[PDB]
């Protein structure tokens, strides 16, 4: 029992209502369980869902998430939930335009050099999906675009094995376009590191998934292509863990 | 990209918790605004076919809240509708039968059962229908109220006009147990009336669904059950001949 096709605007109402909970919490500098949950709620709702990403931007979720970063510069887990939702937005190619914003990129480049890999990993992701889209869709500066490409690659190699799995994925599909961005190794580097990371932490879930969705061929494509050593290194490791 | 595996369930129960807070606030302020009826819809939708969120509703005092809503806004029928329709979802969950046996609650439903708007009394009928269908042994409250309620159910349905669609369904399954309740014909009468309503205003979607889910069997079973309430039997053949 419910009221036909009336569930479409309840989830958009929900996004609107959680955003207000973020504002009222940021307003009060109240890093509490409720704020953390609301941030997690927003993250999961945007998962595999470009309509929710759009609603998040249509009500001013970027501006607000910016101001969230700024109000809680040392709260590692806050940042993570913020950047995680923002990684989902980085995935939607139509919304790429509305992330072309140096105040937003300046926040992401900052958190790329976090000593917490949990934080820096999601920053890296946002960067890789944005650099993935080529020089011609980067409406911002090319001194920053080239500089983040370098910082992204060098950052990944500073990363320890993390203790627990840091992220869940329902599908590996968004990674495949990054696997073929040979001109930008840091974008491929992030992709392979992450696949390796979830496949070593939770193979029972992710090896079957990676294989079924057609991942091996992309990985094999890297194995034989002049390619970046590090990217090729992680590449053959994942492969050999199955072949 | 999401937080962890299975995190989605934990954030659905949080949304229910937060939404109920917006209810509690708006009722505190005697405010009947857009957000409140949006919140009430959202809670209604979330309980559709989700025994789990329904149980979460109960465990976060949703019932006592919702009846504060009822007691604080007696004239706002569209509000009462959203409240009872959710409660109708809850009534559909057998493991929650104990929680709805609150005398203050049943007393209020029974009031709205006799409301003037079918858009409000329909859902109250649904709550009462589903409750009586679990039998005498399960009714832990006034055996007399239960026998009065069973007649009043039957009465208030027969006085109902044909609306201009109050409710939607994704399945007919929760009705089918009611179509068997021969000793309790009010229950049966609510089911076939409800079934007939949605089939008559949206046949393309509901008539098929009824058939796919094996509805005709239950209907034809009432047809050749020799000693069925004539009002129930009539609506049932009305439904059947609307396909046969």
Author numbering:
A (entry chain B): 479 to 481, 483 to 704, 706 to 723
B (entry chain A): 479 to 642, 644 to 723
Give verbatim excerpts from the published study on this entry.
To understand the molecular basis of ZER1/ZYG11B-mediated binding of non-Gly Nt-residue peptides, we determined the crystal structures of ZER1 bound to either SFLH-, AFLH- or TFLH-peptide, as well as the crystal structures of ZYG11B bound to either SFLH-, AFLH- or CFLH- peptide. Meanwhile, ZYG11B displayed appreciable binding to Nt-Ser (KD of 6.8), -Ala (KD of 7.1), or -Cys (KD of 3.0), albeit slightly weaker than Nt-Gly (KD of 2.5). GPS assays showed that in contrast to control GFP, the Cys-GFP fusion proteins are indeed efficiently degraded upon the overexpression of ZER1 or ZYG11B. Moreover, the Cys-GFP exhibited dramatic instability in response to NAA10 KD, whereas further double knock out of ZER1/ZYG11B was sufficient to restore Cys-GFP stability, establishing that the free Nt-Cys can be targeted by ZER1/ZYG11B for degradation. The free α-amino group of the Nt-residue forms hydrogen bonds with the side chains of Asp556 and Asn597 in ZER1 (the counterparts of Asp 526 and Asn 567 in ZYG11B), respectively. Likewise, consistent with the structural observations, the mutants W522A, D526A, N567A, E570A and N523A in ZYG11B were defective in binding to the XFLHVGQD (X = Ser, Ala or Cys) peptides.
ZER1 and ZYG11B, the substrate receptors of the Cullin 2-RING E3 ubiquitin ligase (CRL2), recognize N-terminal (Nt) glycine degrons and participate in the Nt-myristoylation quality control through the Gly/N-degron pathway. Here we show that ZER1 and ZYG11B can also recognize small Nt-residues other than glycine.
